[PDB]
Amino acid sequence: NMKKTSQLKWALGENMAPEKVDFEDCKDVNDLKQYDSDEPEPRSLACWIQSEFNKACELTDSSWVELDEIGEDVAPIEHIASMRRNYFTAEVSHCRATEYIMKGVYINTALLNASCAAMDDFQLIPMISKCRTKEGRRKTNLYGFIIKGRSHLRNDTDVVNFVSMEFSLTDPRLEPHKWEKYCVLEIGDMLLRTAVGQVSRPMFLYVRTNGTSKIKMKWGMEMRRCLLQSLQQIESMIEAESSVKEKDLTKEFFENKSETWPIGESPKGVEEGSIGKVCRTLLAKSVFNSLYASPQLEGFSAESRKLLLIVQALRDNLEPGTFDLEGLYEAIEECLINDPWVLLNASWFNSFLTHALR
Amino acid sequence: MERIKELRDLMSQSRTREILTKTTVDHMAIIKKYTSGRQEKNPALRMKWMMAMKYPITADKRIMEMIPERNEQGQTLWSKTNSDRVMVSPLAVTWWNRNGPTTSTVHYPKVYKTYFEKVERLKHGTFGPVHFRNQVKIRRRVDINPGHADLSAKEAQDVIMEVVFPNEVGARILTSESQLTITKEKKKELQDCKIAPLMVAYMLERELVRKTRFLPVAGGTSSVYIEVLHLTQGTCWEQMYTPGGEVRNDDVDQSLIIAARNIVRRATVSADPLASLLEMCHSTQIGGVRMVDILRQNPTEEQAVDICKAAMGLRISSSFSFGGFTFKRTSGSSVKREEEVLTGNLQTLKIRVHEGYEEFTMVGRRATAILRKATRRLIQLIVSGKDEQSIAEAIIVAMVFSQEDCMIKAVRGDLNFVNRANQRLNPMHQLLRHFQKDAKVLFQNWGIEPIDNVMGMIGILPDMTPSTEMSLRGVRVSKMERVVVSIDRFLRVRDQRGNVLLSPEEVSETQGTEKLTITYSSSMMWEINGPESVLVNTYQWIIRNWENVKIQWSQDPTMLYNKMEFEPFQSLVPKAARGQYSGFVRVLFQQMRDVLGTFDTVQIIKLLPFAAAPPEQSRMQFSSLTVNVRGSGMRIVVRGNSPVFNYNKATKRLTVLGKDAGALMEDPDEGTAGVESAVLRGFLILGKENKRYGPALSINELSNLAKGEKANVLIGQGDVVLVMKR
Amino acid sequence: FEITGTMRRLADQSLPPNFSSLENFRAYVDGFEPNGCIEGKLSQMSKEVNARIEPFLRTTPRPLRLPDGPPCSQRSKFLLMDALKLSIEDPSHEGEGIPLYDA
Amino acid sequence: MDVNPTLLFLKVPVQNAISTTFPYTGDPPYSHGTGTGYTMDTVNRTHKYSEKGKWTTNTETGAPQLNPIDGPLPEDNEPSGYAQTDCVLEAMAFLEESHPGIFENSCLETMEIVQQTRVDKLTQGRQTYDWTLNRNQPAATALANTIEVFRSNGLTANESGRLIDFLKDVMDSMDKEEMEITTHKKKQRLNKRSYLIRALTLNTMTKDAERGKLKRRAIATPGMQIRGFVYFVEALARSICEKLEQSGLPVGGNEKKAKLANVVRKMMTNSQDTELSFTITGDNTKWNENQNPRMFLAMITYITRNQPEWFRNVLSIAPIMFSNKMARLGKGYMFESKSMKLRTQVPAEMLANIDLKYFNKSTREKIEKIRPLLIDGTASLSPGMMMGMFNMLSTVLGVSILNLGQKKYTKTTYWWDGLQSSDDFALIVNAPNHEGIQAGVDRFYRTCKLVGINMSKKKSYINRTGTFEFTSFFYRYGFVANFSMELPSFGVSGINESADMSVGVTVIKNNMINNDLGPATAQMALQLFIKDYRYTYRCHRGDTQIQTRRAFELKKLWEQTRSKAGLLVSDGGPNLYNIRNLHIPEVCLKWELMDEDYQGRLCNPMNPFVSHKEISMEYDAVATTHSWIPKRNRSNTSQRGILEDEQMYQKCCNLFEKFFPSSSYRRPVGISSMVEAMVSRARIDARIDFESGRIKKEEFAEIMKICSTIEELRRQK
RNA sequence: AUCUAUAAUAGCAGAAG
RNA sequence: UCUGCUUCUGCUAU
RNA sequence: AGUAGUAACAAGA
């Protein structure tokens, strides 16, 4: 437990809730007003979220998930499934999005357990992760620290405040608009080998006040379902081709890489990746849905599904017609306010329209 | 004794007395559900939020004397809470599991016998190979729990109530002999039972009560195959598997009938139906057991099963089943035609009507009868049942069998002729089920006639009373063998005398679903599959082999049309259409090889199966061709896409019945000029409408034009185009 | 089952505008037979009430309009691509598993 | 390269990857404050869509009521509540003409239902408005409070136990001079108008955890006086919907998919070859706000023609009560002063006599627009259905409009049919050319306008027949699998260790069966569930190093056990599950592999973590020790007076079960009181026992004497 | 062959509208 | 002063 | 401050 100092009381927002009084004792206050219920302030799409997503799709060196054992394979379909699952686990355990999954699960679990066990304490929670290096030995990683505030959470939307201090090597003065909520300190210097020569690089501490609720923490501990969301789609595509070929095509998709899927765009145009790259992209998309969950994302997904289906009917040569296309566009754009994930998804939709109409 | 003193104690007080007196038994359930607090919500979050605590479990205070407060590490296993409840840690559960008093008498195997039956079925199961294939799963109602074979769900619940709670059954009485037998055996088996009656009732519900669900199924629909549905059937793969226990003979009979009907239907199309049929029955398994081995030891009465038995030199029954009665035709013949009728509840529906005079011996277990009938007419019915309820059963069955318009108009009430999922039900079965609950109106509207009192017999009246004067219009009461056969190349089953006993035309056209999985081993594992699978796999074979098929379609088309691969398709084409369709398609193909520049790979692939029949000449122009899928005629449109065959020009992937069939490569000689030579018989489509040539006429209006003459035709899905007569 | 008293008056006020009692409305409904009511109401209704189908062509859809303002900020509960970790090559120390030791 | 997942749709059709477009891995949006804003906005929208209607004042409640029926035909394409009664009656008449006998058979089955249904049915509800407390309460608690107040006011027909007798009690309660509420003991007296307003009130709350919506909305819950009538009306409408081929209700799941596929298939079969076929994926806008209760009354009156009059009355009461309904405004608002750093709650009941200076622009406008309707903290809401209260009757209305599409009614070359699930609909239009398709679509749209149904133009689209969406079921020449929608069902459920194992494995298996969950992904889902289970329940494999409070006992049990493969996962055993054995429970899967002493401990008949029933001799327990009961914390208000009532209720019910063994297996029936039934049972049991020979003279005499003592105590308190 | 149903215990959880 | 209605599905037995 | 987004949390008794 961290001592409740002045700086900890300020950063954790202690005594920041107004005193609850009766209306007959405060009806004659000059500035008594209804709670601020403004529309969220609009923001523009910045290029850092596309870089975040590009990095979340990358292949890593460490293995970020150690999956349990299952019973022995007796049926031939269980052997086929085990082979396909070995390919899937190879693709998914070495993805940066899997590290994000494990990080978020650990952090949300630690925060929920601290909020339950110590309601009146400022608990010090280290951000710990476990991985397995390329050589195969276990490795423990510290990302920083979290101090949880008071967590007398009556409802399931009640906010517990916390302070997060996270190590980084990224200069905060290169994209300052990204770091609006943070106070970034310089805490050290770091010696890094890159090819043959090491340099002394400043090591920063990104500090910020953040908040969460029991619902957000519950949905953060259950983030490993993102793996299923991607893998079920990947295997369905595999199976979709297997039925036409009348043979298991897992090896032909993963090893030969003769089959590709449009998964990105470059100055040259549309880029096609192998089934493993598609798996990592869908995993990263599910993980970013989990990390950037918002009502804007829900509205945008539900409303843009209809435009996707209309474009599909157009590509299917099914003569699609609309009634209030402008109304659908208005409903889609009502959801694009400030959330970077939703703005990135809308930019993705515009790119998809460009490529799909021509 | 204890309870009455307890009740007196509660009535001695004031508030409990007011509760016991001012609360009826009906309101006791309301006050029992009565809860106080903030209810509960999202218990998963609660569980994650309490397992980190010290004592998340509540137990009875008796646990003080069973679990110590501390283990050998000083960790507390229970803590008193300021009542009879006590907060407890999971460490207490593990301490009981490792140090608690053990015993040799556990009730788990008996209370949960059905789960151990699942275990035994899996332990002794047999795994075959996995085959990757185009899978067609159909959503239907299947058994999740088989229950007792004799009892129904209502009867099983009645048995359970009588066994567990004898003095609480109310007005209810067990009527069936199977009900009484099972009640006796369960009451004998459950004396001195140390299990609470609730859990005994639920064990009996697991043992006896039948339960069904709608599931997407491929393969067998029996409960032994539904319990492992996740393991055997996938999106693109079938895992050959056979459960470990003993098969029910009913399921074997049903699956044998299904397989025999499919095999006979596919064999009728072959140029040598006998050899084809024998090959199929030699290459077929039913629930892991070889079909020929089943046919040599199964006493199933069915037309196609008897044809299968005759083709392999076995004795047949030459009999069938209807309404629980075994029918054996003694003399006469018949054909089958489709007839639309209006019922008594104003429901129009088509019935398979049998034309021709015939006579039958109708044998039940509690009844027996001689029937003589004509085309929708009950000429004579001499019943010889034991009891008057059995007599009434046999009379109802015979009136439904006769297909009389009186019977069809006697329908009253909310009799549905469709499934809840809007699937076609068998009309005859529906009429039988409707009249077996109450056939009063049928008996009134049947008719009466005076009796001459011959042979000493007596006639029965609509009130189920014996009368010497009058009776029903043809009904008379009375007081009361496998033959060696031949079979020819075309599956006609003659007797020792030489008169036809069976024919493929007598085989029922209903496409059913097997109870036990049917396994076929040949070049085409789909040859005796259902219609959707047959269509998908036919088109998938055509486009998978499109190189050699395309090279052969030009060099020797007759060799291509004669391939066996199109014969499972041809069994789905209506018979009377086949030749005509074939002729049409072939003429199209010929006028496609004559016009250079007109080459459409999709058109050839679409029409290629329909050219597998002996072509009959005709002057008809078809805008579509019919295939029979599950009792309905699906139409493949000659031009453009359809809902049974649609080619996506964008993805280049053909889709048949919603199942992907594969992609079509880029043919260099594809015709981009816009001209079509394989849509109309004797007409080249040159493009869109030209108003110079007059208004658009009909497809069937084009037979009076002359060669060297253009016109505008409304041929297609509302598309007017410009054609010209060659 | 009788509708009397307060319920009768509520029924008398739960009707279409041109009915005063539930009994009169029931009598009207019992005597009702369809005679061109829908066709007449359709002939009366203005032609501006319609569902005109706009064709959706390749040149029909426009790109979505993203909002304007300052650029968006990071809102994750932790760093994602800028995260740096201090790692131990093998947690082979005493009292392993507790997070404070490892930290 | 910039990664764009949406570009995957350039090769994979949107349907075959629809699961990608459902972001159901993140938390759903919740509401944080009050729902008064959404309630007021709903009321104002409902009165805006019907503003050209006729205003009246209710002689019984004093509330201003708006009647848009037979109002001016709409002039634009905005949502309109001006349904014409003659068009609704024509739709009903033609539905009966196209399906002869549907309404007669439905009314027969519903007469049986109405005569047999018990009042206990009402306890099958969730949070219910309770007029006795003017608050939300569990349905059984609200019903018990209502019955107690009715009894203390001399209304006791519900003693018959039939729902219709409780409805008669409600009918008679709406005619009393004053209602007596007896709290805990403060004796309140409502008058006729106040009780009447409380009886026609639907409490309003905000809908939480809702996907696909940017903005929140309000839901309503009615009181006990409304729910029985609504249940009878919905039973009649369900009987009707079951006989219609276009109804997407009450079929659900695989049966619903099969019905939709078969019906669309038959529709495509009926359409001739030369015809143009199109399909509209269609939503209706402001469905519940434009469904008028007066049109529901007209529909019920036409459906129940030539029926007994009591049946028509009991079916007519729900539309009448909904035509005169009041919507409770909710919790009110919260006001903050920054300078004084204080916050206060302003109840909704003082939103009519409050100063508008406190509120922002839009809330001030809402209050100004809604103030004429405010009575006793509720708003008069005559138009509208108040959020899915008559799902099946509105389904019937939509299906009638669909049925009006046959060629015998369009009398043109175009025709239409389709599928209707409340508000959602799939419309197949057939016509010889595109102009005919446009004419059929216009005619369907205008006919819907005539009956108060407004097709959402921005949410609906049309394409050649073959692909559509209906109730989140995507049809691309056949329905496709959508696994994301079932994603929130994966995980630890929080019941207990045994039940959580069963639920996890069963969910994986059923998703393999129904949602195209592949075998490799099924194995990985099994691994992930076992990980989450071991984390939640602190039951990691015995031979591990994870440090927890339970780990020492688990290590002891592990080292103690010869056959480790028999230990349950909750006991630190290995995971033996695979695709083969998902359908087999865990205790049965490894019963053969268990050590005898561990097996006899886990399944010990005197298990102390489960409840034991008396026969102090008790029945043997069957469940394992992993079936323990989680402590439910229910401890800060004044509603602590019911804890003792509920305790005594439980005592009485356990005594009754001691007298009636099957009372907890099946619901008991009876008009007799508890003491009378128990005494008569004790007497007849003692008689047949002394006769058959289990008790002697003296015990029989003692039992009869205790029975006589109890009977004189019940007659003489 | 039928089988929400020739049917009705209850509670909780997920989905849909 | 706060998870409604309806439908389906799954699990469990105070 | 922060969470958050049409109204709340930033403890309450």
Ligand SMILES: *O[C@H]1[C@@H](O)[C@H](n2cnc3c(N)ncnc32)O[C@@H]1COP(=O)(O)OP(=O)(O)OP(=O)(O)OC[C@H]1O[C@@H](n2c[n+](C)c3c(=O)[nH]c(N)nc32)[C@H](O)[C@@H]1O
């Ligand atoms: O489950 C199906 C089937 O497998 C099962 N079944 C069939 N046979 C048996 C036996 N022998 N044992 C156990 N189970 C059996 O019952 C179901 C029947 O299949 P289904 O496809 O649903 O109906 P089917 O097409 O068989 O027609 P159905 O109405 O049942 O009639 C059966 C039989 O009766 C002949 N038949 C009827 N009528 C009115 C006839 C007539 O007037 N004249 C003549 N000559 N025959 C008549 C039918 O044509 C069939 O032969």
Ligand SMILES: Nc1ccn([C@@H]2O[C@H](COP(=O)(O)CP(=O)(O)OP(=O)(O)O)[C@@H](O)[C@H]2O)c(=O)n1
């Ligand atoms: N939880 C729910 C969701 C839906 N419903 C019922 O379904 C209808 C359509 O909801 P809907 O959600 O489709 C209406 P939406 O599309 O959001 O907006 P719009 O009306 O402007 O078109 C509602 O009006 C209710 O009758 C319910 O009773 N409970």
Ligand SMILES: [Mg+2]
């Ligand atoms: Mg819709």
Ligand SMILES: [Mg+2]
């Ligand atoms: Mg909608």
